[PDB]
Amino acid sequence: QWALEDFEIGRPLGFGNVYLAREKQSKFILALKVLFKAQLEKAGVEHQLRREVEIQSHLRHPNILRLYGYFHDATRVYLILEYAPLGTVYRELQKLSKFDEQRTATYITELANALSYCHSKRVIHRDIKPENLLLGSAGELKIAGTLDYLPPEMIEGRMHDEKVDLWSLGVLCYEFLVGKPPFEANTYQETYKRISRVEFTFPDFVTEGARDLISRLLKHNPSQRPMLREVLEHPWITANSS
């Protein structure tokens, strides 16, 4: 059982705010997520958070952000999270516009690993996107509305499985190389039609090796999408990863 008295709150990092924090006894640096019990009870997704924390703190992977613990105060609910010093992949993306193939392949590899571990633990993520991707001190990737990353089977409300994260991995591979998601539009409506029709095009600079992998991942039929092992063994990933 923790308390707010154990932590020294630092700079803001972000239904509330995420702060830099230092545990007093150990001097351990962490991110402390602050959420108000008012918004959580007004949305009723406190059970969704009860289950989410049950899952997040039970998993151990170098590419999944760690949740150490949690606790609630008078009106707040606190999440003791890992701290990823180099920030979000979303900030890196807009600070560099696009990623080269070697950076893309490594992230994709680290993702495929983190997902293959999740899929072996019967967990399907559904929602990877740059703003949910964080960077550790070594620069390694870490996994912590808008339709851009959702598969056709999901937005159409059909039954879905592990192949959902394969679609997302395709969308992320495209975005890394291009700077924008393959189905981006100015409205939720247009984006919906573009995803369901699976209509995307490649800019000239995108190599055929990348085009192939993305085109394999972005199949409408979930069954035709490669397994994560095939992703990690793709010639384009092979040639460019770390």
Ligand X SMILES: O=C(O)c1ccc(Nc2ncc3c(n2)-c2ccc(Cl)cc2C(c2c(F)cccc2F)=NC3)cc1
Count of positions on this chain that bind ligand X (CB under 6 A): 16
Q: What DSSP string describes 111-139? A: HHHHHHHHHHTT-------GGGEEE-TTS
Give the amino acid at 208: E
Q: Is 49 in the site for ligand X (CB under 6 A)?
A: no
* Residue placing its CB nearer to ligand X in the complex, 144 or 178: 144
Stretch near ligand X under the rule CB under 6 A, chosen from 76-84, 104-112, 162-170, 171-179: 76-84
Residue numbers 173-232 binding ligand X by CB under 6 A: none
Stretch near ligand X under the rule CB under 6 A, chosen from 85-93, 179-187, 205-213, 230-238: 85-93
User: Which residues sit directly before a break in the chain (C to N > 2.5 Å)?
Assistant: 14, 144
State the CB neighbour count (10 A cutoff) for residue 47. 9
Q: Does 33 belong to an annotated binding site?
A: yes
Q: Does 83 belong to an annotated binding site?
A: yes
* Residue placing its CB nearer to ligand X in the complex, 144 or 237: 144
Q: For residue 9, what is the enclosing H or E element?
A: strand 7-12
Distances (CA, A) of 231 to 86, 109, 189, 196, 236: 26, 8, 31, 23, 9
Give the amino acid at 40: L
Q: Is 91 in the site for ligand X (CB under 6 A)?
A: yes
Q: Is 134 in the site for ligand X (CB under 6 A)?
A: yes
Q: Is 132 in the site for ligand X (CB under 6 A)?
A: yes
* Residue placing its CB nearer to ligand X in the complex, 17 or 224: 17
Binding residues for ATP, by number, are 33, 82-84, 131-132
